[PDB]
Write a protein that binds this DNA or RNA. Structure first.
Ligand SMILES: [Zn+2]
Length: 86
RNA sequence: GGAAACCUGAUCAUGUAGAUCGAAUGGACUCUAAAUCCGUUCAGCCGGGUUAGAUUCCCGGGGUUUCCGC
């Protein structure tokens, strides 16, 4: 499993995973320089580094999650898309 | 010029989903206050190796500190 920058990982899945292991659905994301600006379906906005070595990058290279965000309304199809990356 | 240690909100830790703090935000409560609490969110400086799996081990870059040297 090659270690790519975070924007590649969310570009492939369309999903975000928070520090609590919660999956959110990405509504918008945009890169600027080394930052990513992200807007979830549930309304949360966040600004992170576009690192290939971050904690959330490690989570997105793996296939586990603790819970899905209710307000994001993640479909079983998208969740399954995340679980079967390989 | 050379050696060692460490790494970007803070302190610490770390091969099988790191932690605590702090901050942003929503709510509860409240008197549409303060205080308090709860939910949500925020991480590995960069570029590679190795690995089933790495912020974590190895190499390199950059930076900081300490130490050695014309
Ligand atoms: Zn959400």
């Amino acid at each position: 499993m090659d270690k790519k920058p975070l924007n590649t990982l969310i570009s492939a899945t369309g999903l975000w995973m928070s520090r609590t292991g919660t999956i959110h659905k990405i509504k918008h994301h945009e890169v600027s320089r080394s930052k990513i600006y992200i807007e979830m379906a549930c309304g949360d906005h966040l600004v992170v580094n576009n690192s290939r070595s971050s904690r959330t990058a490690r989570a997105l290279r793996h296939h586990k999650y603790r819970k899905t965000c209710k307000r994001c309304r993640v479909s079983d199809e998208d969740l399954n898309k995340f679980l079967t990356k390989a």
